[PDB]
Amino acid sequence: IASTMAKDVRQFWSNVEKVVQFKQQSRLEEKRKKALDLHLDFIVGQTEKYSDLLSQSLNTQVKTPIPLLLRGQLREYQHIGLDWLVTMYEKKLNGILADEMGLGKTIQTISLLAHLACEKGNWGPHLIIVPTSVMLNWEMELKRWCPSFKILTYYGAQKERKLKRQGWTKPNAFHVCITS
């Protein structure tokens, strides 16, 4: 009888502690809510301040021409995006290009690399991570538009990958690497 009593009382106080846990969870959600809302205004304000600071140095009109490395002409929106990417680079920010599919984001990035190579003298090792289905497409687009980049397509079995990595740390071994 006393064990039944203890079980009943323990269930009752488990319900009481469940109520207390609901209370503490409601208080945490408030802290979670204000913490989420507070930092949102912080990260947002900081990002917008950095973008406004970035748009402050624009002359707007495009300043960058079609770099010498390009063998073909660039569209109007492509040239505008190239100028925007060059501004982002000059001001040391990272970029997200959300142009609709088919607008030549590949060509825009290739023109950005062309500018960095011609005017800034930086032809780095430029890593490019793309889906396995478009590695050949990126390689062909690079060979087509910018023929001066040393392209290294990182594909094949492990042994082939090791063979390609042999001596790849040397300077100027390759300019742009394309991987999946």
Binding site: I43, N94, I96, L97, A98, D99, M101, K105, T106
Partner: peptide
Amino acid sequence: LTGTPLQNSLMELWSLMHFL
């Protein structure tokens, strides 16, 4: 480089921004 809109999840947006 993205071809789809970033309107699917605030968590995905935060991940992409933190990576940026």
